[PDB]
Amino acid sequence: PKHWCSIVYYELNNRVGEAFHASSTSVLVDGFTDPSNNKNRFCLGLLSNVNRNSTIENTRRHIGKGVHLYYVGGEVYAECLSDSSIFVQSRNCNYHHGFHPTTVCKIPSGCSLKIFNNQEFAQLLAQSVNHGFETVYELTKMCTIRMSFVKGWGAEYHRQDVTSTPCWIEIHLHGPLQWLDKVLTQMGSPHNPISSVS
Amino acid sequence: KHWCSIVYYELNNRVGEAFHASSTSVLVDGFTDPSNNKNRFCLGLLSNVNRNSTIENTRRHIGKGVHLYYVGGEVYAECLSDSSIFVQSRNCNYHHGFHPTTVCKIPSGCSLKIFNNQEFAQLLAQSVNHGFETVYELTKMCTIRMSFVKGWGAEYHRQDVTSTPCWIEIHLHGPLQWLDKVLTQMGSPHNPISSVS
Amino acid sequence: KHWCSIVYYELNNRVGEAFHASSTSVLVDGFTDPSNNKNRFCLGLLSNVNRNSTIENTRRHIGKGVHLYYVGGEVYAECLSDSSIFVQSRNCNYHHGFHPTTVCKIPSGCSLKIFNNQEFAQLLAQSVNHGFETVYELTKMCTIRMSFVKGWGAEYHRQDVTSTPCWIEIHLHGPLQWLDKVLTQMGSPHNPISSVS
Incomplete structure (x- = not known):
């Protein structure tokens, strides 16, 4: 039930609530209200936001059973349990499919998708160990994934960034971040x- | 298992970390004990890069602050500060018959019952087949907001709590948990909802 | 032990969760280990939706960052980064005789004792009876701020630390706790006691 990831919630450009730390390979992020942030669920329903508004409140009402993040066999999956769609932006996935890096993938209600593969990322990490601190540092972006509930964003949608969707989350993958650490340590x-003045 | 969690604010911004209750008696004061693992939630040590003189003024008057007591399924608020306190509690407001946004003033030394489980559980019951929209609204019954020294809303300016220099938000875990058990009704x-609009 | 807690900011915004020291040796670098439960406080992996180029430029130069060392009742700062670091610490300023707001630059690979609680305990005692106002003031001594790469205050263009792209604030728990014993006695x-419980 290792802590493979930690997840942070957002409502537009503002961070909302405390961070959630995975204590099992199966974590549910839903819009319900169990305050226990110590185990299986990451409930978004109880969370407050003084900057909240009707349109976000509306969207929050439809997160429902949300998303099911699953970590197994050095691969993470995302299952959309909510009645509404879910949209994910994973570079690792986008690479494995040959899509453009910023590509947003919709996961329809009841469907499922593999959003990350370690062996793949480890390989990419290896292929740049001796290529440049600049490019190896960039791999950091690979270890975070962003997905929003209900509202899409990117091409085909009006909203272009994830900071415009009313309900979204960012998932940090500890395994990948750590390995990346072991390598970046060699700077x-x-x-x-640069300047200490300007 | 924490009967509540509390958060601190200075105007519209959140200040410091969230406090998780480890006992039935909690003190939210303006002093400096760093420990956030037991009896007190100290606000004096918290910094705010957006702080201003007026907020600082208020902070100096917080003092012993408010005492939050949880017993027999009812929670109480006692003002230990030399200054008054103001609380907005739907449950409380529902029990006295006041308007939902009513903000109650609690003078120095006075006490006020701000939450009655019995009633809430009852409300939750009558909410059942009454729909999902109205049961979801019960979430608002689970959080309570109170400010130190300055009041807000009616009988002041009809202004939002975000207009007060020092205020907190309380999340009652018992009620939220039972509510979950029901909301999963589906x-x-x-x-x-559209995915574009 | 929980000798301090640390917060990270990029300009005027707080970024990331609070770190709590679980040992006398803590490394605050710009790399990416997600474990926030031990020796390191990695800033590299931290996201900020308000981050801009210049901030990103500075984050790339934090490197091995600063090393905060607690030993013998004194805390030391060591610049392991290839770029300088700047520290503002009242206690330290007092000891050297500088002005309270003085910002001390710690060159790459150098070291500076930034806190001595023994002298702070002394300061606390001297104020035990000179006003609640002056004792309350010592709270400031308990916090320390330092930015990476960009100097600030006099000797620089930038005057406010919220004007630098990468700075942290350190809260000294022991000093803060001892200060609490006094502020409360005063x-x-x-x-x-309570009237309800």
Whole structure:
């Protein structure tokens, strides 16, 4: 039930509630109200937001059974249990399918999708160990995934960024981040030495 | 298992970390004990890069603050500060018959019952086959807001709590948990929201 | 032990969860270990939706960051980063005789003792009786701020630390706790026990 990830919730550009830390390979992020943030569920219903408004409140009402994140066999899956769709932006996935990096994938109610593969990422990590601190640092972006409930964003939608959708989350993958750490530790980059003034 | 969690605010911004109750008696004061693992939720040590003189003024008057007591399925609010306190509690407001947004003033030394489980559970019951929309609204019954020194809303300016320099939000876990047990009833079929609009 | 807690900011915004020291040796770097339960407080993995190029430029130069060392009742700061670091610590300023707001630059690979509670305990005692106002003031001594790469205050263009792209604030729990024992004994208010519980 390792803590493979930690998840942060948002409502537009504002962060809402405390962070959730996975204590099992199966975590449910729903719009219900169990305050226990110590186990299986990450309930968004009880969360408050002084900056909230009708349209976000409306969207929150339809998160429902939300999404099912599942970690198994060095691969994470996302199942949309909510009656509404869910949209995900995973670079690792986008690479495995050959889509453009910023590509947003819709996961329809009841459906499922693999949003990450470790061996794949480890390989990409390897293929750049000796290519540049700049490009290896960029792999950080690979370890975070963003998905919003109900409202899409990107091409075909009016909303272009995830900061415009009323309900979304960001998932940090600890395994990948840690391995990436073991490698980044080898920096010593005096490159582009900047100013301490300007 | 924490009968509640509390959060602190200075105007519209959140300040400091969330406090999780480990006992039936909790003190939310303006002093400085860093420990956030037991009896007190100290606000004096918290910083705010957006802080201003007036908010700071208020902070100096928080003092012993408010005492939150949970017993026999009822929670009480006692003002230990030399200054008054103001509480907005739907449950409380529902029990006295006041308007839902009514903000009650609690003078220094006075006490006020701000939540009665019995009633809430009852409401939750009458809510059942009354729909998902109205049961979902019971979530608002589970959180309570109170400000230190300054009041807000009616009998002041009709202004939002976000207009007060020092205020907190209380989340009653007991009620929220029971509510969950019901909300999982499942529902909401209502013009299945667009994914573009 | 829980000798301090640390918060990260990019300009005027708080970024990431609070870190709590579980040992006397803590590393605050710009790398990416997600474990926030031990030795390191990695800033690299932290997201900020309000982040801009210049901030990202500075984050890339944090590197091995600063090393906060608690030992013998004194805390030390060591710049392991290849770029300098800047520290504002009242206690330290007092000891050296500088002005309260003085910002001390800690060059790459250098070291500076930034806190001595023994002297702070002394300061606390001297104020034990000189006003609640002056004792309340010592709260400030308990917090320390330091940015990475960008100097600030006098000796620089930027004056406010909320003007630098990568700065943290450190709260010293021991000093804060001892200060609590006093502020409460001097308690500006009065109401001995509860009337409800």
